[PDB]
Write a protein that holds these residues in place. Structure first.
Motif, PDB file in Angstrom:
ATOM      1  N   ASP A   1      52.245  -0.601  24.142  1.00  0.00           N
ATOM      2  CA  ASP A   1      52.559   0.859  24.146  1.00  0.00           C
ATOM      3  C   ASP A   1      52.967   1.348  22.817  1.00  0.00           C
ATOM      4  O   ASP A   1      53.448   2.594  22.985  1.00  0.00           O
ATOM      5  CB  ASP A   1      53.598   1.172  25.271  1.00  0.00           C
ATOM      6  N   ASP A   2      52.877   0.682  21.925  1.00  0.00           N
ATOM      7  CA  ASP A   2      53.411   1.261  20.395  1.00  0.00           C
ATOM      8  C   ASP A   2      52.762   2.444  20.051  1.00  0.00           C
ATOM      9  O   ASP A   2      53.151   3.554  19.497  1.00  0.00           O
ATOM     10  CB  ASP A   2      53.441   0.239  19.483  1.00  0.00           C
TER      11      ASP A   2
ATOM     12  N   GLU B   1      55.908  -3.908  27.503  1.00  0.00           N
ATOM     13  CA  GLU B   1      55.886  -2.842  26.871  1.00  0.00           C
ATOM     14  C   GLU B   1      54.118  -2.465  27.277  1.00  0.00           C
ATOM     15  O   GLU B   1      53.547  -1.517  26.490  1.00  0.00           O
ATOM     16  CB  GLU B   1      55.714  -3.143  25.376  1.00  0.00           C
TER      17      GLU B   1
HETATM   18 CA    CA Z   1      56.722  -0.446  22.114  1.00  0.00          CA
END
Ligand code: CA
Length: 103
Positions: free
Chosen positions: A28-29, A95
């Motif tokens: 998800d960065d 994530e």
């Molecule tokens: Ca992240």
């Protein structure tokens, strides 16, 4: 290929992607609506309602295939976006990215 898992219907869920012979997830960065738009289009939906971070539909397993992805938003599939490397070490499955498409 691409599939959504864990949603209330096929229109949403954790994004999973088939690469190097393996189903994997997306970190998800750098996850945002432009690439959500592309994922939703490649699934046959007309648009994206929301993008979700932090394993919103639960953690996936196995490879985390994508992290730094750049899409203009109009691409037909996520493979057509700018991808400098497949397979990431920076991320945990907590994530895994998710999407909610328009139907
Ligand atoms: Ca992240």
């Amino acid at each position: 290929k691409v599939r959504l898992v864990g949603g209330s219907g096929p229109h949403e869920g954790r994004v999973e992607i088939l690469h190097s012979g393996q189903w994997g997830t997306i970190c998800d960065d750098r996850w945002e609506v432009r690439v959500g738009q592309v994922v939703c289009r490649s699934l046959g939906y007309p648009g994206v309602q929301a993008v979700h971070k932090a394993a919103h539909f639960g953690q996936g397993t196995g490879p985390i295939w994508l992290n730094e992805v750049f899409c203009f938003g109009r691409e037909s599939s996520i493979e057509e976006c700018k991808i400098r490397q497949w397979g990431t070490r920076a991320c945990s499955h907590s994530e895994d990215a998710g999407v909610t498409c328009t139907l």
